[PDB]
């Protein structure tokens, strides 16, 4: 009971106005103890629940003041609590308790956190590692629920400026979702709030995330994952509740884009960033192919001044995140562009830099090729490039200067054997398949009489080995990265903007709309499904999209099922109309589309052949009256 | 602000009838952007029906009560919300009629403390000043019943003692603001001393409305 009493006294004193006058160091001394009460499990459970409640209350009180070292130490403490470095010492319960704690702490005053830089620095790199890491490496459902709780809060409140770090997390969900049984259900159920709350999240993502050059495409990927999740075949790998959430997402998207559609003039309509991005993303597929035919294609797009080897070499030089590295390595491996081999590496700079850092930089430029004879020229040009970059001073060579690059003046063979020996270190040491461990003294003695029939400086090779040993590997796909796997360390207008959505995605969306309407037996789902299809039909009319606006009504026409002796109008193809509720429901909306259509020219030949039928067969089953134009009948006196 | 109601409706929906109000609310809550004309008694009504009902299990009640604590501690129900005094009257009235059923996970004795803490937060906050006499009397009766009963653990009894010593301050501090009635006329006692009695325990396993 005395622990409950001291907890109550702490809550009363810290929530009081006089609690604001406590020092900005003693609050941490309080917090360590009263949070260790929460983390400890051997005490009674009701005492733990009291600890949770009073931690929530004191979190409200302390974070309300942020409007100062205490909050920095506090975020450090929560970082240590939640992150997986200290997973061994901490339990599940304390970790999840800290997780909803930081969720509340960010959610109460997350808007103001953008201004102050120190908290944001502490929240970007180390905190986000925790929520990113927990998704791939967890099994218990409650912890994943809490992490997605926090992540949804980040996206919904702080998604504006916290921009690049949304990327690497948000793709990975599809890697577990698009590719565990209940985890997929939890992911889909908890992600729906993301699109639901923010009113135009897809359009905002297309604004800031997609058309910007640096960031990849996520919204198109999001829809391409969702439409695959829509079909009932996905129920073979997901629960029955999953397709309703996806259908709610799609219907919400089209309803939002229709709510944007209330009052705009068609004649008033008649991108400045994505126009480059179209051919920019197209040429990567040509470069991710046998790329010889793509090189003259690249020049035609007004990208490079001339077809000289210097220009294409520079072009391959600047961009590093775009081209597929293995393909560019294979392109460099070919023997019929030896001129490009000589001139591309010439533009490098080895002034005042060591060979170890040179190889460390250059291995990132391309994956090391696995070919036998093709690498012999590149692993040789490795050495040959260095002679002219470093200006030669033969009269200043000596071993007295330690840790010196100017002292060495190697010839072609010296740097050749240096490069050929250095490449073997990673396979010898870092790779695990070599079970027999090789001593470095034999490796150094192998280089006897190499520096122009003499030994290289042993201090240099010793320092190089001391540099390269720091990244030993034990036991390659991405196994996470200590440096965050990121380079952070290093009304008419909006309609015009999302004009490009349908030209990318629309056929997939209408395919998603169909194939569930047919199979779904329930009335309530089907009427909303066809109403959604009507919304897409209206949206097609403003734009041109001839293929979509033809195919959708052709599918509806085939879906109306209109294309014994007869006698009231009984017929072989009238009872099918009456028995099928769906046949009743498609005809009214189809002829509504034909009613409110504006352009005559948009319809196609075979659609016109279709709509002469329906009305002809309905005549032939004596349904509709024949005198459709009684005025002309009266004019003719017929 | 509008987020935090649909949010945790995710959490308390996961209880695989009595839950239909939650999906009805989820359909109601998508396109508002703010809490303007939503009849704020209704937005808390499914939680009140969950906590007040005795038949359903205790775990869902614990989750709902934790959600309600998270509701209040944010101060999402602003003064500008329509009919907020009715909502707080309803939630206190439903709190005092709480019931429970046996469960293996956790303990009812553990989560009675949540009821006590939420009641303490309700009364101590300024919102508690806009409560009627009957509901606060029922609240005090429930807390005194929790304190007096020896079946429950002594730590929860200590919590009951603490919240009662807390709430004497709030109830008797209004005695300064109120002014003396009548004109100090001579008074003759004619009222009972023992008409009332301690209400029997009910939360556990088995001129007033102004």
Numbering used by the authors:
A (entry chain B): 164 to 230, 329 to 440, 455 to 545, 554 to 758, 765 to 779, 799 to 871, 889 to 892, 903 to 973
B (entry chain A): 11 to 26, 71 to 260, 322 to 325
Give passages from the manuscript.
The budding yeast homologs of GBF1, named Gea1 and Gea2, localize to early and medial Golgi compartments where Arf1 activation orchestrates the formation of COPI vesicles destined for the ER and earlier Golgi compartments. Here we present cryoelectron microscopy (cryoEM) structures of full-length Gea2, the yeast paralog of the human Arf-GEF GBF1, that reveal the organization of these regulatory domains and explain how Gea2 binds to the Golgi membrane surface. Gea2 and its paralogs possess an N-terminal DCB-HUS regulatory domain and C-terminal HDS1, HDS2, and HDS3 regulatory domains. The HDS1, −2, and −3 domains form an extended helical repeat structure that is contiguous with the DCB-HUS domain, such that the HDS3 domains of each monomer lie at the distal ends of the homodimer.
Three-dimensional classification of the particles revealed three distinct conformations of Gea2 homodimers that differed only in the positioning of the GEF domain, with each monomer adopting either a “closed” or “open” position relative to the regulatory domains. Based on the relative numbers of particle images that sorted into each of these three classes (~30% “closed/closed,” ~30% “open/open,” and ~40% “closed/open”), the conformation adopted by each monomer within the dimer appears to be largely independent of that of its binding partner. We begin our description of the structure using the “closed/open” dimer, as it exhibits both the closed and open states of the GEF domain. Unexpectedly, the GEF domain of Gea2 adopts two conformational states. The GEF domain lies adjacent to the HUS domain and is connected to the HUS and HDS1 domains through ordered linker regions. The conserved GEF-HDS1 linker adopts distinct conformations when in the closed, open, and Arf1-bound states and therefore appears important for stabilizing each of these states. Given the apparent independence of each GEF domain in the dimer, it is also possible that only one GEF domain is able to adopt the open conformation at a time when Gea2 is bound to the membrane. This possibility would enable the Gea2 dimer to remain more closely associated with the membrane surface throughout the activation reaction.
